[PDB]
Amino acid sequence: PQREKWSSKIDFVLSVAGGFVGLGNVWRFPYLCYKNGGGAFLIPYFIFLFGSGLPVFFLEIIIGQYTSEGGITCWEKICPLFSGIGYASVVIVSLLNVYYIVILAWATYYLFQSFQKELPWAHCNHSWNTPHCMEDTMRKNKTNFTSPVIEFWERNVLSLSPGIDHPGSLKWDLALCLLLVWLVCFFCIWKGVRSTGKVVYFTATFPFAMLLVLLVRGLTLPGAGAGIKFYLYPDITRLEDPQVWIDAGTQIFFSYAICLGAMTSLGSYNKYKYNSYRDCMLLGCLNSGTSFVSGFAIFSILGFMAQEQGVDIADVAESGPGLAFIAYPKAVTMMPLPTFWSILFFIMLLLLGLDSQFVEVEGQITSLVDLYPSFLRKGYRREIFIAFVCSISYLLGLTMVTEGGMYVFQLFDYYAASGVCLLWVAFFECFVIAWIYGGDNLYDGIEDMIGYRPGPWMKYSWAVITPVLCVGCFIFSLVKYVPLTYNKTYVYPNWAIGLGWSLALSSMLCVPLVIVIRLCQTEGPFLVRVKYLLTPREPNRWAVEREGATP
Ligand SMILES: *[C@@H]1O[C@H](CO)[C@@H](O)[C@H](O)[C@H]1NC(C)=O
Ligand SMILES: CCCCCCCCCCCC
Ligand SMILES: CCCCCCCCCCCC
Ligand SMILES: CCCCCCCCCCCC
Ligand SMILES: CCCCCCCC
Ligand SMILES: CCCCCCCC
Ligand SMILES: CCCCCCCC
Ligand SMILES: CCCCCC
Ligand SMILES: [Cl-]
Numbered sequence: 001p002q003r004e005k006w007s008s009k010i011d012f013v014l015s016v017a018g019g020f021v022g023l024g025n026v027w028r029f030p031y032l033c034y035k036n037g038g039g040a041f042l043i044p045y046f047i048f049l050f051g052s053g054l055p056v057f058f059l060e061i062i063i064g065q066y067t068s069e070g071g072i073t074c075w076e077k078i079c080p081l082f083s084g085i086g087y088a089s090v091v092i093v094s095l096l097n098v099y100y101i102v103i104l105a106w107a108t109y110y111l112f113q114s115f116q117k118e119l120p121w122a123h124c125n126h127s128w129n130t131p132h133c134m135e136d137t138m139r140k141n142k143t144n145f146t147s148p149v150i151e152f153w154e155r156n157v158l159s160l161s162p163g164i165d166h167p168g169s170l171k172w173d174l175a176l177c178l179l180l181v182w183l184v185c186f187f188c189i190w191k192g193v194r195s196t197g198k199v200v201y202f203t204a205t206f207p208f209a210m211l212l213v214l215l216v217r218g219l220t221l222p223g224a225g226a227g228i229k230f231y232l233y234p235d236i237t238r239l240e241d242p243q244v245w246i247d248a249g250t251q252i253f254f255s256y257a258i259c260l261g262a263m264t265s266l267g268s269y270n271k272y273k274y275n276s277y278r279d280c281m282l283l284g285c286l287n288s289g290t291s292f293v294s295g296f297a298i299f300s301i302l303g304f305m306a307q308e309q310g311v312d313i314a315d316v317a318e319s320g321p322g323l324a325f326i327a328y329p330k331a332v333t334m335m336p337l338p339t340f341w342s343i344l345f346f347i348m349l350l351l352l353g354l355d356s357q358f359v360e361v362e363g364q365i366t367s368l369v370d371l372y373p374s375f376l377r378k379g380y381r382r383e384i385f386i387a388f389v390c391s392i393s394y395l396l397g398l399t400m401v402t403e404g405g406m407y408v409f410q411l412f413d414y415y416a417a418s419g420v421c422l423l424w425v426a427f428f429e430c431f432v433i434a435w436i437y438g439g440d441n442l443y444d445g446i447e448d449m450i451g452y453r454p455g456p457w458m459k460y461s462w463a464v465i466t467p468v469l470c471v472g473c474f475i476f477s478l479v480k481y482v483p484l485t486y487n488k489t490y491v492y493p494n495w496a497i498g499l500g501w502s503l504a505l506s507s508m509l510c511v512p513l514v515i516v517i518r519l520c521q522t523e524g525p526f527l528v529r530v531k532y533l534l535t536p537r538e539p540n541r542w543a544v545e546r547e548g549a550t551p
């Protein structure tokens with residue numbers, strides 16, 4: 001009957017902050033900056049952060065607060081047509097839940113490797129190391145040598161195969177680790193949904209307090225001055241390639257968990273007369289500051305490795321995912337008692353990723369339960385659903401656990417819940433809000449909800465800045481198209497790129513397909529059909545709290 005509200009604003013802030021501040025900050029941003037050269041990644045990043053990151057994030061939160069519904073029915077309130085956006089988000093988040101947890105699996109594996117006398121990536125004299133491996137300290141002291149940390153990441157953790165078309169034998173240890181993290185998610189969602197809520201004082205303060213330590217270790221490294229420069233001074237030429245702009249925009253959208261329905265649901269649990277604008281601005285500041293400062297530390301470590309190895313910074317580690325699994329495990333080796341600090345670091349990674357996964361999976365489950373309110377949300381009948389959603393997404397994730405699973409992970413990362421699909425969904429959200437619902441019409445709601453009409457920046461972002469940025473990046477990437485590559489050496493087969501585009505299209509096609517379906521359901525001439533489907537169905541149809549009216 002009545003949606004359960006937050007106990008207080010503190011609960012909302014802590015839940016959301018633990019929600020969108022996770023592995024998209026300490027893991028994705030590092031190698032996304034590293035892959036796109038150096039500081040040339042920052043110029044689009046911040047622009048999107050001030051052009052589409054904060055505005056769309058606050059728009060999602062404010063729609064959730066205005067309609068008090070999840071990611072799906074909120075659109076039906078705002079606009080019956082273009083409802084597929086919600087479905088699109090669901091598909092996106094589903095695919096995200098498939099490969100996001102895989103990262104945690106790796107972290108868990110690393111954790112299980114930490115509990116021993118000497119870290120396995122300190123020196124390379126083990127069975128999995130190629131004879132070309134040479135220790136980092138001895139690399140520049142005196143061809144094509146490899147470092148123990150990278151060896152451990154590829155040969156042992158991943159057992160990397162020649163290509164995607166050679167999946168090979170499934171790795172059982174990583175499969176068990178993925179099962180373990182999915183079991184943690186399952187027992188933290190069906191029961192103990194607020195388990196992290198009562199221990200936030202450890203779940204929120206520790207991940208930051210740990211990062212600072214790395215930062216203190218990062219800057220002190222002798223080569224940091226080089227690395228920070230690589231992280232800061234941009235390259236003008238790199239800005240010409242569409243890849244940097246697409247990566248920066250989609251990294252903004254991924255870090256803030258927008259176009260997923262999680263933000264709308266989180267904003268659906270708060271009060272109507274709640275000043276979510278200021279809270280959202282502070283949370284976005286915290287998110288971007290965490291990303292920027294963590295990049296400082298990891299790029300200082302990269303500069304240290306480059307100066308010690310006698311190699312260029314751009315060729316010191318893996319450009320694809322695993323930079324955070326190459327730089328940070330090397331940094332924790334330099335600290336006194338490396339085992340303890342490595343354990344703490346991977347525990348912090350687990351906390352961040354697990355909290356983010358809890359939020360995303362719970363949002364997806366709530367959305368699907370909204371789609372099936374009688375067939376679900378009936379106790380045990382709901383419980384089984386959880387056991388379904390994890391399992392079908394666990395088995396589907398097992399394709400990323402085979403020793404050729406890294407390439408599949410790269411496909412999912414670049415296409416499934418990131419790339420031109422996120423731009424598609426964000427552009428359609430902003431188009432519906434600005435050019436159909438009306439920016440001033442939604443300011444009429446904001447002014448009543450928070451008590452003051454915000455500045456013209458929010459409306460200018462949805463009206464012009466965000467659609468223009470999204471369409472420009474999309475069309476400019478399609479014009480100067482470069483095939484997706486893993487670690488800038490592997491050239492994907494055509495069928496692999498076809499599968500990745502199928503993954504993107506699974507969510508993209510929801511917007512037009514649902515439009516066609518809704519037009520088919522309604523009767524009459526086309527013009528009155530679209531006019532009737534473009535009328536909001538009383539978005540703030542609530543009287544329990546002090547509210548005004550739609551016009
Ligand atoms: C490593 O080998 C590759 C492939 O032959 C070559 O392109 C590259 O220059 C070599 N790098 C070093 C550091 O020897
Ligand atoms: C010879 C080992 C089995 C064949 C290759 C592994 C395939 C695992 C895919 C799991 C998907 C559920
Ligand atoms: C700029 C492209 C959109 C043109 C305006 C469409 C608005 C239709 C809905 C009107 C609601 C009264
Ligand atoms: C009108 C309500 C039903 C819309 C269903 C859309 C589902 C899209 C699935 C995309 C392929 C998995
Ligand atoms: C990965 C498939 C997601 C299916 C979502 C269905 C929404 C009605
Ligand atoms: C490492 C955390 C940095 C946070 C900066 C912004 C604080 C509101
Ligand atoms: C339930 C789908 C009905 C489709 C009817 C199509 C009429 C053009
Ligand atoms: C030049 C070092 C800056 C570090 C900011 C946290
Ligand atoms: Cl970020």
Ligand code: NA
Pocket residue numbers: 017018019020021022351352353355356
């Ligand atoms: Na978190």
Ligand code: NA
Pocket residue numbers: 020021022024025254255256257287
């Ligand atoms: Na983030």
